[PDB]
Symmetry: D2
Subunit: 333 residues, 4 copies
């Protein structure tokens, strides 16, 4: 039995979900809520659905199950609430808002709506990382002791974006912070170091173009996250899980398996994927297939609204540690 879905937003992120839905049998798109209606009808009219300007138009309906929220990160709150107060399961993108307060206000109002809200942490749904998480849980490498994550964007985003980014910790490291919890949910301490090695731009906005985070798990686990705002070879996304009986790591993905060998060098492979949509193509699809299972059930979604709350809390904690030169205790006593 198929299910209907409503698609908020129509920007870069909106095209992905829309298209993946059509490919999935158990789902069908029907509308798009975006102020820039001209850019909302270049996606709605696309898959065979209608398009509006304001959200209220959609919130003034009565034939939609899933709510794939895909608009700016500072509007999500105002869109998740009105989906909970209508008992319709939703799936959002960037973790709630950038302001922790607004986020808490959202939790309270929706009370336990955090059950009906699956977050868009697509990395958990990547086959490679998901496999490592599952295999680790299956005790394949003994007790998890160390988790190393290396993430480097190809280059800094446009100046305008950096201004409303919320800082590297809230804008970038946050995805890594969530991945950490995916493996070790109970983080007790946060230590972070920030630097400025190449971006003059990022520098004046008093943000970092490079950081390293070390988290402590409730059982002695050390999660080490390395970040950088640029990377000449592509979108570096590695992860290493080290345990008592072995190690599991994920390599980067290249478009082909071709390798060149000549007088200058051997084993020359392609640069790795330079765009997050490419690298995580399968992930978004799997995430959607999971959003479908949680609807056919109703037990709740994972990652949920709460996961996003803590992720942001981890990011702010990282920022405080970086500015203070000391380890931050997440929850005292």
């Amino acid at each position: 039995l198929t299910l209907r879905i409503a698609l908020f937003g129509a920007g870069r992120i909106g095209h992905v979900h829309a298209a993946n839905i059509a490919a999935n049998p158990d789902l069908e798109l029907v509308v798009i809520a975006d102020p820039f209606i001209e850019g909302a009808q270049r996606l709605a009219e696309a898959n065979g659905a209608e398009a509006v300007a304001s959200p209220d138009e959609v919130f003034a309906r009565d034939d939609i199950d899933g709510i794939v929220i895909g608009s700016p990160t500072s509007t999500h709150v105002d869109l998740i609430t009105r989906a909970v107060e209508r008992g319709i399961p939703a799936l959002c993108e960037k973790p709630i808002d950038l302001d922790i307060e607004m986020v808490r206000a959202c939790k309270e109002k929706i009370g336990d709506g955090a059950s009906k809200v699956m977050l868009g942490f697509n990395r958990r749904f990547d086959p490679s990382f998901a496999a490592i998480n599952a295999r680790v849980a299956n005790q394949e490498i003994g007790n998890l002791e160390q988790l190393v994550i290396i993430s480097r964007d190809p280059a800094p985003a446009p100046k305008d974006y950096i201004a409303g980014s919320g800082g590297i910790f809230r804008d970038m490291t946050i995805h890594d912070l969530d991945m950490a919890r995916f493996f070790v949910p109970n983080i007790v301490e946060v230590t972070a170091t920030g630097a400025n090695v190449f971006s003059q731009e990022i520098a004046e906005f008093n943000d970092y173009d490079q950081v390293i985070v070390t988290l402590r798990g409730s059982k002695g686990e050390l999660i080490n996250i390395v970040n950088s705002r640029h990377c000449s070879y592509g979108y570096d996304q590695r992860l290493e899980a080290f345990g008592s009986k072995g190690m599991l790591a994920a390599d980067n993905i290249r478009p082909t398996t071709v390798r060149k060998h000549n007088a200058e060098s051997t084993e020359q492979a392609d640069p790795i994927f330079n765009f997050f949509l490419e690298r995580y193509d399968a992930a978004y699809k799997a995430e959607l297939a999971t959003f479908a299972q949680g609807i056919r059930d109703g037990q709740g979604f994972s990652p949920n609204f709460e996961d996003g709350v803590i992720a942001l809390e981890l990011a702010n904690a990282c920022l405080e540690s970086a500015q203070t030169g000391r380890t931050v205790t997440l929850n005292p006593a």
Copy 2:
């Protein structure tokens, strides 16, 4: 203008094409034919299309822009002819036929209509293999001197399939023989060696469960093909191009980039893809897109009918060489 496609065969390959046609935005599947009606109806409704059991019912339509032939080999000459006689382009799974004489007869009846036939040698459309071909053509490694291909199927097909497959050369090596021509169009000599090392079943049909082929190109190029009818770690599909200035080789593909390291061994990766449909997912989609563009251009197809004829002739030359213990010259003096 969306192109209308008729599909023959509701089998496994049929499922791939149907799903790819749906996904392709320039195409639309309007009818599926398969004597096994329930099978066709099942696939048709899953793609919003009609289902018929006979080709007569297909050709009764007057809106067919293109045809995909994914039905049994014994139906290839018939479907190709009917489609071409009606000026309808046809993408046909290899081979044209197992009998070179029937292939010749067909070529005569259709005459110039042969230009509307595209042969489904999907491996040419594999990103990795296609990249290697284009980069070699671009002189990246100088003059091509050797081409080493290693293809090993996971296991022998079912008995009934083996019975009418026409032998390892016409059924399996044929794909490698075409890949060879993709790189070196002009082959002058053929040498082949067959053996029987594990399969009682393959030996029962007077066929080989493993062969080695060495082709001589018009300029001294040596193409070396290695085949086996079983492979414990998956569907082995490697290719190496060696030239005067370097080598380009393609590795196998795995479902994840995960590697395990413990006391037993390091760099442990997943077994490689086991099914052709998975290994060549991208290839089939790229092949379909090329078919669509050929329908729009009317400028012909590649691989073409002729590539299908020569591929079979090379396979026949292989069998003859293997049975005689000598090299076979394709074009006498």
Copy 3:
């Protein structure tokens, strides 16, 4: 042209240096000093040198223009001093002493005669790590921005060694701290995090079995070191240099290049070397050749005494950071 050398100690490290000295055509061992003279006699007799018990006997000689301290830590500060007196070039092993005061006290005595002392930080001489250092210095990857070092010993050392080791930072991490300086000589800040996840024995000795160090270089370089007291697959010794124009990394080393592929896993390689002596065979040899070329030049050494001092200081700095949970500034204002 040759140079006489005198080794102190006949333990594991002693054997290694002796053979290397004999191996190097420009050198030749003459005597070995060790309180367990029985072995000293045995070993020497296998090279072509005499055997004594205490340093006094070695100091009752007048034919020593090369010194090597393979003897235990307790005798390091002792021999270095008693050797600079006669002004003879020397090469000591691991850390001058675990006690920084003793080091300062030693530095205060030899005063300027520290320029003749070389430190046995063999890793700097490994062909792989050294190549990376030199290539980075040659601007091959632009400006160095990140350095990630992952070291993991196969298993903990005997209970007695752990008791008198001086902690993971002084005993293990110190090698990585020097490697960090080999790349970024100037370190401004230190941050360390320790934990206990598997060794009860290490826990009762108030030591850590896991630690993560992040050092801030004078120009914003972030150096990230990861350590662990056990490793199921071998002696993990990886290093990664990340710059503005690329990245250089070193893999672990295996005894053979054999790879196995089957139904369980593909690309299975051998477990990596599990003994530091095997892994750094080439390093120790290069370390010696550099020592010799230094003596046959009288231009000092590298690594030198000052490097060992700073190394212990970083170690102590790390410990200080781990216990307080705060970043430590090496030189205030």
Copy 4:
């Protein structure tokens, strides 16, 4: 009791054995022979041995426990005969002779003296190739079904060397043909194919600069050898053993484990070793030790005289196969 060795040849190969004899604790080099006395003297002097110009001067001594023949092929038969008739064990480099008749003449003359001849097919002693041979023998990958060997020399040897080399099969493939027997002793058929794609010099001497060989084993095993007289990235020496339960392959060797990653390509490794002395360092040393052991045991050597015989008979068969474009049956009925 240190065995005394006499070395014939002060050239490239002679230099390697000499250095290894010195290094080896169970051996002592007492005399080197070479018509070019200056080289023999120069080398001997660097090994505390004596230098003479003729074999007579070597056989005038009565203390020789073993002989190593590293002199030109034209002297192999003479030196093997003289040594064996005097009861002296002899390790001889590839080819007893290039002429199978002279080889047979030698065998007829020395009779049971052949048991004192070890053939220097050093590749069997490579740790990697040897490990694979042993693991296959231990049934690790089931029944051996295919063996693929790819050998590419960095470049053609000097003209004069090529002039008296006896062709690519006798000079180059012979090592691969021996490797084949190391895995499958019983070969029943030979098929070979040669081409001329780059070297005017090789074509000038009616030789091939490129060959592909396929051997049939007594149980249907297929051994496939690929050769080329040039290779831009180094000395390509790969081997792949494919069995019913898996596969074992050996990768090429590089000087370091360094890999570069930038905008052009990722995983860039060093060019592989370009000199056989570098690639087979461990093998030559292991081969010498095996020679030393055989001298003490008196049980015989492996590879033995017959291996040298059959390896040549196989090379001749390959040439005959290539010239006639027909498969050759090794043992007619």
